[PDB]
Amino acid sequence: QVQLVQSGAEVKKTGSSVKVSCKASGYTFTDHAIHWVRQAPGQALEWMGHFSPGNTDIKYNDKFKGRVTLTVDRSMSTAYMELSSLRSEDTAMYYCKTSTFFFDYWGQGTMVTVSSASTKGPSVFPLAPSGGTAALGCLVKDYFPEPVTVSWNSGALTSGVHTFPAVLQSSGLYSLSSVVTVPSSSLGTQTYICNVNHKPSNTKVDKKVEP
Amino acid sequence: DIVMTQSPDSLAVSLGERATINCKSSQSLLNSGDQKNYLTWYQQKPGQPPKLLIYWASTRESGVPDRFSGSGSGTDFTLTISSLQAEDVAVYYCQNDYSYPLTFGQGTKVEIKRTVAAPSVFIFPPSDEQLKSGTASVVCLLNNFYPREAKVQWKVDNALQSGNSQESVTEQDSKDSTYSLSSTLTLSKADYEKHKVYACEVTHQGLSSPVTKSFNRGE
Numbered sequence: 001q002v003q004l005v006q007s008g009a010e011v012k013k014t015g016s017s018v019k020v021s022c023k024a025s026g027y028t029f030t031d032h033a034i035h036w037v038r039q040a041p042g043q044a045l046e047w048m049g050h051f052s053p054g055n056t057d058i059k060y061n062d063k064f065k066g067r068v069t070l071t072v073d074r075s076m077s078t079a080y081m082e083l084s085s086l087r088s089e090d091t092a093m094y095y096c097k098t099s100t101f102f103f104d105y106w107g108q109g110t111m112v113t114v115s116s117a118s119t120k121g122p123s124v125f126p127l128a129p130s131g132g133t134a135a136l137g138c139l140v141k142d143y144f145p146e147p148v149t150v151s152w153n154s155g156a157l158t159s160g161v162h163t164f165p166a167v168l169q170s171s172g173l174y175s176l177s178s179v180v181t182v183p184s185s186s187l188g189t190q191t192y193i194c195n196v197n198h199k200p201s202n203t204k205v206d207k208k209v210e211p
Numbered sequence: 212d213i214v215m216t217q218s219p220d221s222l223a224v225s226l227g228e229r230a231t232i233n234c235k236s237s238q239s240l241l242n243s244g245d246q247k248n249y250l251t252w253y254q255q256k257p258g259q260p261p262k263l264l265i266y267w268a269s270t271r272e273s274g275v276p277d278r279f280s281g282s283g284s285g286t287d288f289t290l291t292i293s294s295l296q297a298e299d300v301a302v303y304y305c306q307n308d309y310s311y312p313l314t315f316g317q318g319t320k321v322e323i324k325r326t327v328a329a330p331s332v333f334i335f336p337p338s339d340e341q342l343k344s345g346t347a348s349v350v351c352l353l354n355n356f357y358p359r360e361a362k363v364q365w366k367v368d369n370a371l372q373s374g375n376s377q378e379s380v381t382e383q384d385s386k387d388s389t390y391s392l393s394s395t396l397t398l399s400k401a402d403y404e405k406h407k408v409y410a411c412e413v414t415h416q417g418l419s420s421p422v423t424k425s426f427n428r429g430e
Contacts (some may be wrong), residue, residue, distance in 0.1 A: 035313075044318050045318075047306075047314060059311055061312040063312070095260055097260070100251075101266040125338040125340055125348070127335040128335065128338070130334070135354065137335070137350075139348055162381055162391045167378075167379050167395075175348075175395070176379065177379075
């Protein structure tokens with residue numbers, strides 16, 4: 001089974017550097033070039049360069065040449081992408097992948113967030129219930145970095161749940177709401193608890209939302 | 212550098228109907244040595260890496276069904292998806308594989324077109340817990356509507372707000388092809404406690420009249 005496993009998400013301040021790794025397995029490392037492709041939030045794919053491990057052919061997009069360095073550790077079947085003098089434009093998902101179009105395998109992506117924000121778990125506030133349908137929810141405010149996960153009633157409630165994509169606020173912290181619609185006749189009998197997990201800060205909040 | 216320009220930027224196609232996505236390159240991608248066009252198509256769903264669909268302009272990747280078809284030559288290429296399915300909702304990219312730097316088109320986002328569906332609107336005042344913090348968030352929810360275009364206006368004591376709200380929209384629901392949207396108005400506690408009537412007014416193609424949901428602070 002061919003696998004490309006990338007290193008975890010990173011937060012860096014502007015001007016810093018980041019080095020992302022890409023561990024290849026399930027094939028002979030020197031059989032394919034490793035390409036690096038990134039994608040800023042909501043934007044198009046962008047090709048950064050490639051490293052061909054068998055013969056050390058390294059090619060860069062001039063947009064990144066001199067700020068990015070591609071290397072490999074052939075002994076560990078690992079490719080690296082180092083990006084220096086980080087800027088706001090560099091907040092993005094970074095992917096490694098094999099070959100051009102002859103061996104379609106991609107790593108799972110590494111999110112690099114360029115920010116001066118400190119890691120912070122969210123404040124969780126109720127969106128209380130005010131046609132037999134009632135809407136309720138949780139406002140998941142002021143956390144950093146991405147991502148958060150939200151479940152309802154420990155995963156027992158999934159129908160009608162909408163957990164919105166996060167927005168970045170002017171504070172540099174993210175915010176989102178998770179909402180669910182339920183029968184009004186259940187409001188007095190069924191407890192509704194949003195389970196908010198923010199793994200970067202190891203925070204877990206279970207907030208009961210009451211009418 | 213080869214510039215790759217896709218058209219349209221977004222496409223809404225009914226289930227079972229044909230989607231057509233065009234990709235134009237600023238230079239020919241036809242390789243004299245093998246007479247192949249080095250044009251590649253990828254499918255990318257949110258949160259996932261792209262997936263190879265077609266290469267050499269018209270050769271389908273193994274595992275890709277034959278309702279995906281690539282055509283064209285030189286500078287003008289087309290991806291046709293026949294009998295569109297919900298699992299085809301994605302952003303599609305063409306890529307220049309002819310000469311460095313390898314460059315991508317800007318993407319074409321495909322969604323399912325369905326009959327117009329009006330949003331169900333809900334408003335939520337800020338929680339007492341949040342108010343202790345000096346900032347107040349007021350949330351307006353537009354639930355399960357199509358198409359995605361919608362106008363959400365905040366009114367405070369009937370004054371139209373500007374600059375102090377942010378919107379978030381879901382991806383398309385795979386089973387019913389709808390969107391939901393949140394608009395969040397952020398005020399200082401001082402401003403929140405100064406004013407009384409909080410309203411969000413929603414305009415949408417499915418509504419013959421705009422829908423307003425409102426509350427009076429403290430009720």
